[PDB]
Structure formats: C-alpha cells, structure tokens
Design a protein around this ligand. Structure first.
Ligand SMILES: O=C(O)CC[C@]1(C(=O)O)N[C@H](C(=O)O)Cc2c1[nH]c1ccccc21
Ligand SMILES: O=C(O)CC[C@]1(C(=O)O)N[C@H](C(=O)O)Cc2c1[nH]c1ccccc21
Lengths: 286, 287
C-alpha cells in the first residue's frame, strides 16, 4: 500500500530519522519558534507527533470494527487528521504530512484502508520513538524538583543478557503478534512520567485483544508487558510503582536473572533523561 | 444543558484559574513516580489536554455530519477517548475524565450528543487555555537559541490599551455571527509560542461554522482579526510579520488609525506568556 513507508520503517529501526535530527538541532527549514529559539517548536513537535500516533492507532482499531463503514472511516480520518498532520508537515515532518493525505484517499476495500493505517501508524510510532529518546526531559529537572515460549533480551552496549518467557496463553493473539516480530533490535528508553519501567517501540502494529491485564503497582520485577495504545511498546518492569492501571501480561524475565535488571534501568534512565547515549534492546527466540 | 456542572465550571474558569492547572504547575497534584521532579508530568499534562481538546472539536464537527450515524460516532468516541481521558484523570483532571465517560454514553438523538460534545469541548478548551498561559515556554530559551462592517472594541487590561475594530460579517457570515453572539466577553490574552508575532485568546464559544474565506497569514496586515476553531476557538490578533503560508479565516481588522497600538500589547502579551505569566485580560465588545 505504502511501499516507501515500509522502506523507511526498516531503515529507522536502527538509524535516526533525519526529521528528528533537524528538530533537536534547531535546523528545521523556516525556523519554527517565536523570538529566536526552537524549544517551543521542539516541545510541540515531540508531543503532537506522539499524540498523533495515538490517534492513528485508535483509527487503525476503528478500521477493524465492521459496524463502521469504510466510507465512514474515511470521513472520520479526513476530519480528525489534517489539524495534526498539517502542523507536523510544517514543523519537521513533511514526509509524515505527505502520507497522511495519501492515507485519506479513497480506498477500494477495508483491507486496503487497514493496510494504509497499519503501515502509517508504525512509521509514525518510530518517529515518536526517536523523538521521545532525544527530547530533553531533564530540562526542567533543575528548577522543578519535587520535595511458555523462551525468549532472550539483550541490552547493548551494556552487555546485560537475561532469559525470559512469553506467556502464549494469557493474551494469545498478542503473544503471537510479538513472537512474529522476533528477532528485532530497537532503542531501549525509559518511562519519563511514572514508574521504574522501561519501554521500547517494537516493529509491529498489534490490534489483538488484551483480556488478561495486571495492575502495574503489583507487577513483579522482570514483568514483561505490552502497550498497544502508547505505540506498540515492549515494557520491562524493573522496579516499583504506585500506578494502579492494568497492563496486558506479555511475559516475565526468569527468576534467576531478574536481579540483573536494576543496572539496566539505571543506565536506560541516564540515557533517556540525560546523556542520550543509545541503549539497544534485542529480543530473540531461544 | 446536558452537562450543567460543566456550564458552571465554564462561567467560573473564564475569570479564575482552574485548581487543576495550579496543582499541575506547582507540582501539587495530590497522591500523584516522577523521579524527584514534576516537569515531565507538567509537559504531558499541558500537551495532552491541548491535543485532547483538538480531538474533541473534530469529534464535535463530526457530530454535525449526518452521513456518520450517531451510533457510529459514539463508537468512534468510545475508541479514541479513553487513551486520552484516563491518563488525564490520573494526572490532574479527574473531573474531565469523569465527564468524558458521560459524553460517550448512549444518546437519544444527534442534538443531545452534539450538546454534550460542544459543552465538554468548551470546558477542555478553557483548561487548555490556562495550561498554555502557565506552561514555562522560556525553559529552553537560553539552551536552544538559533544563530457589512460590524464595529467592535478591544481592550487589554491592566495596560488600558484600546482599539476599535471591524468584524467582516459578509466573508465568514456564520463564523462572524457566532463570534458576535458571544460578545461581550473578557478572557485571558496570550501569545503564540511557535508561529511568531500573533496573539490569541480562547473565546467562550464552540463554533461549527464553515470557514470559506481564508487569507495567507504572511499576507495579513497589522490589525487583522482571524479565528481558529480547530486550535480552541481562539480570536487571533495579528500585530507583526510571519512567513506562514497557511490558511486562516478572515474575521476582521483593527481600524487603520489604531494599528500602531498593537505593538506594545503584543510585546506585553509575549512577556506574560513567555516569562512573567502576569495576566493580560482582553475584552471584546460591540460598539
Ligand atoms: O505514566 C502514567 O501516568 C501512565 C503510564 C504511562 C505508560 O503506560 O507507560 N507512562 C508513560 C511514561 O511514564 O512515559 C506515559 C504514558 C503512560 N500512559 C500514557 C497514555 C497516554 C499518553 C502518555 C502515557
Ligand atoms: O505554529 C504553527 O506552525 C501553526 C500556527 C499556530 C496557530 O494557529 O496559531 N501557531 C500556534 C502557536 O504558535 O502557539 C501553534 C499551532 C498553530 N496551529 C496549530 C495546529 C495544531 C497544533 C498547534 C498549532
């Protein structure tokens, strides 16, 4: 459907998109940002592309709902998309805006529209992944400070390796979807709002049901969860949190390897919040 | 009114800062880990409530499209809303997430659903308005530097600056009628933080009017009045240049003999939104 987006998705799994490089260095054409700075444009670029990616996934889900006609889906997309994609096109993402218009073109079938949305969502998810990695989350930390399928996870250049287990029965189609994407190597980043957890944008768009979920605060060390709605992310719980929402249970790092995760979470913290030195997560079947 | 408490909160929040915004911007959201800082949660709260409001208006626009059934719309809302509202409910806006659920309930007619969406949209619009005013836009200021004719009156306090203006009632007729029906109002005046020298103020209405007559922003004269429904139903005042080649509905113009009075306001308004956060209040009234 969108063969060029497929090539860019394959490239950006290991290479920084030039869109993200220009935004974070303040070299976007036509210089966005009032009065000689580009932080405000950087703030809008990072957050809008993220929330745009959230809309695109929920629209992909809507494309699977057969109670809504294909013509209605296109009507919903043509109304909700432009205010986001037009701004993103003039603020660092011209290719994004290009294929946003193309996704909204008339579709011959629900399968074609779903194929556009699924491919376009993964492409925007990867732009969000890189944008999240390079956004200066510690900029305000100075003056806003408070008072059983076996698999293998590897973090480089840390060199840490752990064995894990995918639960293929709890969320069957979800586990199947993640297992189908193996092996992959993507950037490993940290949560920036809440919890001692890290997530990595995995190369897939799963619309599987998630009947089996577990409260985050009760998630054990080494818990493998997955978040479709925030970008199809593999999440590793390495420490405590008080958030009471529930996340789909994907798997668990084995008991004898779970104590190895604390040093990963600390380094992944340092990279997401400060140094921006890449940490690469590899997930593979054993 | 479908959600009358929201209407009450609308009336209050035009003049008073919502307690949620003050709690977020001071890091005092109760029981809210953020690793010994509250900037990141502030960053997500501000941007997500703004983009949530952007989705809600497009859903309000969809509510006037009779080719999409009311049942297909409620299906659309029930799928798109929770990822936004549940996050906002746990990060400072419990009342917003509480009423987001009531928006998605079964509706007896299209008019009842549109009334829910329009009211909820204006409520989240005012939350976004205050969050925009108080967000620390100067945080990266140092680190990331580059190398017929309807007569109306606009007054900015505490400056006391005053300009007469004309509303172009025959170009975007339904938009002009919607804006004129909201007069008089007094709202917070804030500055654009991305696209240069314009200032906008979230106006107390949700217009679903068509916007046929648009003019390139780079071509708008000093004193041009424009209006943006999709970014929060904002009255926009042009006072400086811009290279934006984008479209914006033409609403009116500050009269020629008063255009010199806008530079000092735009300078003072920028000082507020960007660093000082001292409120500048805009009153728009008929003449
Ligand atoms: O943090 C929360 O309150 C919710 C949990 C959450 C996650 O599932 O990863 N945390 C992320 C982070 O910390 O970066 C941000 C985030 C989460 N859900 C979200 C839903 C919508 C937008 C953003 C988020
Ligand atoms: O900035 C741009 O590139 C577009 C012009 C714009 C405006 O309509 O006022 N500027 C605003 C600002 O600077 O705060 C941000 C903004 C604008 N459209 C938008 C559309 C969607 C989201 C955000 C914006």
């Amino acid at each position: 459907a969108l063969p060029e987006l497929r090539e860019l998705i394959a490239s950006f799994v290991s290479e920084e998109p030039p869109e993200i490089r220009r935004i974070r260095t303040g070299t976007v054409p036509d210089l966005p940002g009032s009065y000689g700075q580009y932080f405000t444009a950087w703030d809008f670029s990072n957050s809008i592309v993220r929330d745009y990616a959230m809309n695109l996934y929920q629209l992909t889900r809507l494309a699977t709902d057969e109670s809504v006609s294909v013509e209605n889906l296109l009507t919903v997309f043509r109304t909700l998309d432009p205010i986001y994609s037009t701004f993103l096109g003039y603020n660092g993402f011209p290719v994004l805006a290009e294929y946003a218009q193309r996704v909204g073109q008339p579709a011959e079938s629900r399968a074609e529209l779903l194929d556009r949305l699924t491919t376009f969502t993964e492409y925007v998810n990867r732009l969000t992944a890189w944008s999240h990695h390079y956004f200066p989350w510690d900029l305000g930390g100075e003056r806003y400070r408070y008072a059983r399928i076996p698999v293998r996870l590897t973090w480089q250049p840390l060199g840490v390796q752990v064995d894990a287990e995918i639960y293929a029965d709890l969320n069957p189609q979800l586990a199947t979807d993640v297992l189908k994407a193996l092996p992959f190597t993507v950037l490993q980043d940290h949560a920036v709002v809440s919890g001692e957890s890290m997530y990595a944008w995995a190369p897939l768009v799963s619309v599987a049901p998630t009947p089996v979920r577990e409260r985050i605060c009760d998630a054990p060390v080494g818990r493998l969860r997955f978040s479709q709605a925030t970008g199809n992310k593999v999440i590793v719980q390495y420490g405590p949190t008080t958030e009471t929402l529930s996340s789909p249970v994907l798997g668990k790092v084995v008991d004898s390897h779970a104590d190895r995760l604390a040093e990963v979470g600390k380094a992944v913290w340092e990279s997401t919040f400060s140094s921006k030195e890449p940490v690469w997560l590899t997930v593979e079947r054993l």
